[PDB]
Write a protein that binds this DNA or RNA. Sequence first.
RNA 1: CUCGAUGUUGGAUCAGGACAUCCCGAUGGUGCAGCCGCUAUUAAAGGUUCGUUUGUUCAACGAUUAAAGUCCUACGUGAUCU
RNA 2: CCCAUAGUAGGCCUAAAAGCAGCCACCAAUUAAGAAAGCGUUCAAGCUCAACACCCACUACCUAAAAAAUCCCAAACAUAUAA
RNA 3: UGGUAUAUAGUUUAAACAAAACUAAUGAUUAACACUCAUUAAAUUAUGAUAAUCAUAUUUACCAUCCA
Lengths: 38, 38, 101, 122, 18, 43, 222
Amino acid sequence: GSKAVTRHRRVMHFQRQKLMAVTEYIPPKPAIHPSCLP
Amino acid sequence: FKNKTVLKKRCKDCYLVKRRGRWYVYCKTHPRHKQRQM
Amino acid sequence: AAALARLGLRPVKQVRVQFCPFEKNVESTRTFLQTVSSEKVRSTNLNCSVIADVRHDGSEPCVDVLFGDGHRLIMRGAHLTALEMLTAFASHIRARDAAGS
Amino acid sequence: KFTRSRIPEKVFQASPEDHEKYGGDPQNPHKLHIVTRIKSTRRRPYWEKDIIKMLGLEKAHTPQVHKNIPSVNAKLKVVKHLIRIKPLKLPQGLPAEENMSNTCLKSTGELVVQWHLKPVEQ
Amino acid sequence: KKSGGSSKNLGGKSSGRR
Amino acid sequence: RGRIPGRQWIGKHRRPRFVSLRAKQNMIRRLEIEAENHYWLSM
Amino acid sequence: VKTLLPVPSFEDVSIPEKPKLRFIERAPLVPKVRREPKNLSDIRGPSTEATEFTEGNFAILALGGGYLHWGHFEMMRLTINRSMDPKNMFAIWRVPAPFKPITRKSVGHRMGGGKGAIDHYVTPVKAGRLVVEMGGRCEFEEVQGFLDQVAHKLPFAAKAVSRGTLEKMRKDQEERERNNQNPWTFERIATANMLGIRKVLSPYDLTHKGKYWGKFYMPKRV
RNA sequence: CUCGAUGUUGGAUCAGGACAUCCCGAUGGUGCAGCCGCUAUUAAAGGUUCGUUUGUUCAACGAUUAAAGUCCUACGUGAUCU
RNA sequence: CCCAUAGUAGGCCUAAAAGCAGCCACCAAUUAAGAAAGCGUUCAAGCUCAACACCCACUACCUAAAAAAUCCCAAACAUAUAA
RNA sequence: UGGUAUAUAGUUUAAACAAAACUAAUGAUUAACACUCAUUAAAUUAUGAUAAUCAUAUUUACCAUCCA
Ligand code: FES
Ligand SMILES: [K+]
Ligand SMILES: [K+]
Ligand SMILES: [K+]
Ligand SMILES: [Mg+2]
Ligand SMILES: [Mg+2]
Ligand SMILES: [Mg+2]
Ligand SMILES: [Mg+2]
Ligand SMILES: [Mg+2]
Ligand SMILES: [Mg+2]
Ligand SMILES: [Mg+2]
Ligand SMILES: [Mg+2]
Ligand SMILES: [Mg+2]
Ligand SMILES: [Mg+2]
Ligand SMILES: [Mg+2]
Ligand SMILES: [Mg+2]
Ligand SMILES: [Mg+2]
Ligand SMILES: [Mg+2]
Ligand SMILES: [Mg+2]
Ligand SMILES: [Mg+2]
Ligand SMILES: [Mg+2]
Ligand SMILES: [Mg+2]
Ligand SMILES: [Zn+2]
């Protein structure tokens, strides 16, 4: 097996991969683009 | 032409142009400044 | 200036710029005068005379160029940009240069 | 090392917003849970396999009723990721000896004391 | 095949005292 | 071409697995159930 | 009428007597005899030491974990000293000299036969640590160029920062967490063991909160 | 994996493939005058020698050639040979 | 993009140091231009930049590749209401 | 190709702040020499950093080198 700290980016367990995908930052999206308003 | 991953203008007469799907540096004053995106 | 100076005024016998400064449509013609009257452009050919005529008759501005070959170029700046006039002026210079030689 | 998980007590402190979302009353807590297993115990530590047995949740999708008390909730918290918890609602009160045999647990969590299998005349 | 060295730490095999 | 060294889903170099849209929806669907479990265990 | 603005003044600033970076030795003066375990946790997670500015206003900020051997120190020293203006600039080391011994076995040897002999020394670094700090009568734009050149040559992700840009970095990360529209966060799911997720997570993830993976720091993770 | 056997170097025979091009083709740069070179881009259709010593692969040497390429193919190939 | 005169080749050191090998100062003429930010000259010349004028450049200020050996490798598709 | 060592007057040779040896010149000595003695002249492979110690490439020495 591989150690917890590696030189390459270690592959994540799929459950963890799904965790990361589901918890990604979602920025606040305004209803109307601010550039389209006075 | 020398292949370069990072294109840099080497004099004031160097100009960046995108041709055939890749970026080139052309220079008429110093033809040695010619670069091709790698 | 530099762009026009690089070509030179070898085949230009005389350049005459006529405009009415009090009018509101002379900005383009006056900008043309500033470019052609530059020290660099004039230095290319010392036999070419740049003549600036200031009139208050109310007529529209005009630019008259006389080449050594005898052909003339009349550019009316009432509805022309300085860049357009300079571009046409340079083209005729190139044409009259090859003809004479 | 993988070990049992201590859940911070703050996780189980409902905010005013939660009461609006789920519709519970903090001053009138429900008496009984409806607990259903919805997730396998395979690939789970042995201590979670054991508590599912203690709660009678060996068969999935089979509702079991449990008391809403600290000791029971302590077991439910260990397997909260394997089950679905809903409050038991008694719209017509508790079943009586007369209507013991005419009850039905609906999917809404309401235990009705009459099951006529007839359309509503209303 | 290279000839290897040996460990210089002996002892240290005591069992737990319970 | 395109071989994965050794066995596909173990070891240092593995076949990359990607998270589909429905895999995300499946996880979020179960997160909502557990979030509600927390609520009913609070009273 | 192009509008001029007041130029910043550095009259209060004072340059130390030794502005240039001092020499870092390959190994400690007294060689270590006891061989140490690998202890990779010393480059894992956020840094707790040397995270704040001290004397200067500019520095190189670590964005990952890694070990600095003597070769790196020479690259940093020669590049900064050659590029800096000694009269108006001063630089100090924000990392200790190589002190952790690294063992190596003889070439071609088999597994076993005891631990290897000490070969060289390294300096462990964690993400968020200032590696070199610069100051003096200069602006960030003056030193940003050669500081970024040094940062690119380090064995870990790094970037030249200043007192202003470092504070803006931290404020942006705090704002992203506050305005995040995703109702689900790695912290909430991990600390509550939702879905039994802790069966695939490390005990360190309770404090790392998905921002660190091995020695790598993920700045866009909230 | 194979020891109720997957015969072990170099050579002969016949070669399939890669291109990170030795020669031949087409281009950019040059501290490219020209003749020769150096470096890079593109190109794998075709070609890539004969000898003395050594079992040798290599290496050295002699005489040549537009060139005497680098690799993989169970360090290709012994139910074809040596 | 446009444009560039001048106390003056500041003093010092130096065979020579003229904005630009080093050391010190870094003041002043012109509405405007650093005792000079980058090239250049044996030293000078010479070409730019920061100035003025003209005048809406009405700048992004996050980075950036690819090569192997029998023969690429499902076919395809940006449009009809989340099931 | 690969590492391991390598360098000091003109030469020869310990050691780096430069010691002796020979050759060179000068004196003392002899009738004149040689010998001897004294004195003088005379050097650290050159490049970058630590500040005089590690590197850097050279330099020549030194062993290493299909395979079954
Ligand atoms: S689309 Fe509304 S401002 Fe451009
Ligand atoms: K694998
Ligand atoms: K790096
Ligand atoms: K066998
Ligand atoms: Mg492990
Ligand atoms: Mg013990
Ligand atoms: Mg024991
Ligand atoms: Mg496989
Ligand atoms: Mg058999
Ligand atoms: Mg063939
Ligand atoms: Mg090719
Ligand atoms: Mg061929
Ligand atoms: Mg074979
Ligand atoms: Mg036979
Ligand atoms: Mg066979
Ligand atoms: Mg002056
Ligand atoms: Mg002077
Ligand atoms: Mg001077
Ligand atoms: Mg000048
Ligand atoms: Mg000079
Ligand atoms: Mg300017
Ligand atoms: Mg005598
Ligand atoms: Zn150029």
